[PDB]
């Protein structure tokens, strides 16, 4: 029989890495209340250098979300321990796509949440991190295989400029698949 699936808001593949931290519901899916979002271009290894960020949230109380190509074992260790002790609630997810595409979506995530993209390929390092660069949302839920953002507080005008520019990037290139990914 024919089946129709419909995905509303922001949702895509790639779930969390460590199932050890969990929230109020079951099924493994983790929901956050007025969540905090961070995004990165490269992977990471040290965790102490993340002091200026994490501590800030520890002064804010708001739960955190992390986006990168990957996150190493000790980072998940600190994160899972800290979430288990209940001082700070954090989740981590590997980058969605590859090369230029993952970045091309990282910009839209940044603009949709309202924050600004951080990139190692740009002068700003993983060290240099401010409370303006990090994004904010109303609620986000991430399960084993898929991640979902429901509502970013980022204004619609920014989204307008972005959908404009992306559709402009659509009005070229041959084959379909490419146009399809852009769509």
């Amino acid at each position: 029989q024919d089946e129709l699936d419909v995905v509303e808001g922001m949702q895509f593949d790639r779930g969390y890495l460590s199932p050890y931290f969990i929230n109020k519901p079951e099924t493994g899916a983790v929901e956050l209340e007025s969540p905090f979002i961070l995004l990165a271009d490269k992977k990471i290894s040290n965790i102490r250098e993340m002091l200026p960020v994490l501590e800030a949230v520890a002064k804010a109380g708001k739960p955190l979300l992390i986006i990168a190509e990957d996150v190493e074992g000790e980072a998940l260790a600190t994160l899972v321990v800290n979430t288990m002790r209940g001082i700070v609630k954090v989740a981590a997810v590997k980058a969605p796509g590859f090369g230029d595409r993952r970045k091309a979506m990282l910009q839209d995530i940044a603009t949709l949440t309202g924050g600004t993209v951080i990139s190692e390929e740009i002068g700003m390092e993983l060290e240099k991190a401010t409370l303006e660069d990090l994004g904010q949302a109303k609620r986000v839920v991430i399960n084993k295989d898929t991640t979902t953002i429901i509502d970013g507080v980022g204004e619609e005008a920014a989204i307008q400029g972005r959908v404009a520019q992306i559709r402009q990037q659509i009005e070229e290139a041959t084959s379909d698949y490419d146009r399809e990914k852009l769509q």
Partner: protein, 97 residues
């Protein structure tokens, strides 16, 4: 069982391996690092250089010292507990009061 360092050498005991105080409640994993704080348990006579007898060192037994885990640093087991042996040159500072 008490030990006896031979002049200029200081023997101190390590504290907690990477004492968890980062952030206040955040538990850091192991980044191939150690602890640099300790408490002095044994002290040698003093430096032997410059012939003129032996001038005592400036760290007394019972001092809480912060040091550098250099190359001269060795580990030993006394009464089935892990202790550290070093020199005064490798010792940096003392926490007072």
């Amino acid at each position: 069982m008490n030990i006896r360092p031979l002049h200029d050498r200081v023997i101190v005991k390590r504290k907690e391996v990477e004492t968890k105080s980062a952030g206040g409640i955040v538990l850091t994993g192991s980044a191939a690092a150690k602890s640099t704080r300790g408490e002095v348990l044994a002290v040698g006579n003093g430096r032997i250089l410059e012939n003129g007898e032996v001038k005592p060192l400036d760290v007394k037994v019972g001092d809480i010292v912060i040091f550098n885990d250099g190359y001269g640093v060795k580990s030993e087991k006394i009464d089935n507990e892990e202790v550290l042996i070093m020199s005064e040159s490798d010792i940096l500072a003392i926490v007072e009061a």
